[PDB]
Amino acid sequence: MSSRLEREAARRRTFAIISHPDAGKTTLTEKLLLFGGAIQMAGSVKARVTTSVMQFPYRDRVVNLLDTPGHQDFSEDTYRVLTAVDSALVVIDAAKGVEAQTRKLMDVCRMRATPVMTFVNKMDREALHPLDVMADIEQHLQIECAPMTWPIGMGSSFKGTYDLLHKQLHLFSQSGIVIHGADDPQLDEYLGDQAEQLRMDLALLEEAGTPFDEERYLKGELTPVFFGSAINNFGVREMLDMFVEFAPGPQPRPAATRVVEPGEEAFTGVVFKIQANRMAFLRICSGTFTRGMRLKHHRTGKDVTVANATIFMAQDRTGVEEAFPGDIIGIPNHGTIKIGDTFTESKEVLKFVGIPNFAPEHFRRVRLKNPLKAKQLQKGLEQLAEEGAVQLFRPLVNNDYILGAVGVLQFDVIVARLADEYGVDAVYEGVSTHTARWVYCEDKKIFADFQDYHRGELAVDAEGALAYLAPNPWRLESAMERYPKVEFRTTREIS
Ligand SMILES: Nc1nc2c(ncn2[C@@H]2O[C@H](COP(=O)(O)OP(=O)(O)O)[C@@H](O)[C@H]2O)c(=O)[nH]1
């Protein structure tokens, strides 16, 4: 029945953690790696390409945890990682609830209907009450919460958790203690006065809580919520068990001509990011990757050998070097590549769709220190935008170069690269813009009118796409009203 390819692909669980800085991602990542027996990798993560992709075995699943750069390293590449996973894990600091970056990263997951599980971290310190945390998750992540584990107390009074389906009490300071219904005197023996509160909460959950439903989880409509304390490696086992059991394996991926299924024998993969020193990171969409093989780079029309590929793999497995759907590989190259590029082993022309550019929130105008360098600046900005390092907008009404960054670090990298690779010394000037949307209107007449009236706010980006630049989302909301026929989108397909 199942081929070797389909058996391997079915074992993969490829995901990333979405969280706001200081929620606990690094700490939880270290503990996950320890369950995976990935001792060295955990030591590496705790000490801070090697860590962009961490693969580890757990309960015979091959888990691929892709890093989502955060803090000062937050960039459009963080959102690009989310286009390569089949599911995500949300980590929240229980004292803060859903925070700004949690929401923006969930907005990306939502466009892709990516399933998400949720870990509420730091229950060992005073926290939002669990009913309030659940309401906050639903309100800001726009998803139903299905509690899987439920905390008893918080902070100094945090006794541990009760696992609703496994009927197990997990004590905080280790095997769960099996509990036999709400009346089990084991609850009073282990929880003391807090047993009454667990009983009240369980009664409330029975009446008003949402059960886990795998189909709703897989559609992105419901998230299983776990509570714990990653620093104590507590509650993490239950969440990981649930993740390997229920999180989706490699999913079909749309291409312009058809949907590609992971069980197709012929290799296909898509580039979702590029690291400059260059390495292109490819998600394997179907088929089997082997070092030996030849791949067709359909954009350039060239054949590419991959004898120098990086196969990210666990310290653990030993056999012949191959990689399967859901896995990530890195292909070194001398600058040939765009985000979204498709590689195939067959001659079938395939073009994966659905890796977009994302609307930037930070904008700067570029100024040259030396006017004689104008052609080099145009070359460098165009090549850096084609490569995905920044977005570039050219306003209809002037000749300015306006750069759009998802993360501010990007502006520093562009200046560095302009200097080093183009011999161009550029500085930034501030602009009013904080918002871009790509505009579209299937009515040719109304659109010409829009483009005439709002000519001062329109720009064309490096892909040729028309965009409305606004000082902020509220000023934007006002142009939308004047033209209820024009669509304003927060993403656009790369070509
Ligand atoms: N008290 C407590 N502190 C935690 C827990 N998890 C992480 N921290 C602390 O919170 C801070 C942020 O943790 P980190 O894992 O680096 O967060 P990141 O920015 O999301 O990767 C550090 O001081 C951690 O020790 C937890 O479960 N309980």
Curated annotation (Swiss-Prot):
Binding site for GTP: 19-26, 67-71, 121-124
Matching HAMAP family: Rel_fac_3
Record localization: Cytoplasm
NCBIfam families xref list: prfC, PRK00741.1, small_GTP
GO biological process: regulation of translational termination
Family: Belongs to the TRAFAC class translation factor GTPase superfamily. Classic translation factor GTPase family. PrfC subfamily.
Name assigned to this protein: Peptide chain release factor 3
Keyword annotations: Cytoplasm, GTP-binding, Nucleotide-binding, Protein biosynthesis
SUPFAM superfamilies from the UniProt entry: EF-G C-terminal domain-like, P-loop containing nucleoside triphosphate hydrolases, Translation proteins
Domain tr-type G, residue spans: 10-251
Its biological purpose: Increases the formation of ribosomal termination complexes and stimulates activities of RF-1 and RF-2. It binds guanine nucleotides and has strong preference for UGA stop codons. It may interact directly with the ribosome. The stimulation of RF-1 and RF-2 is significantly reduced by GTP and GDP, but not by GMP.
One cellular component term from this protein's GO annotations in UniProt: cytosol
Primary location recorded for the protein, binned into one broad class: cytoplasm
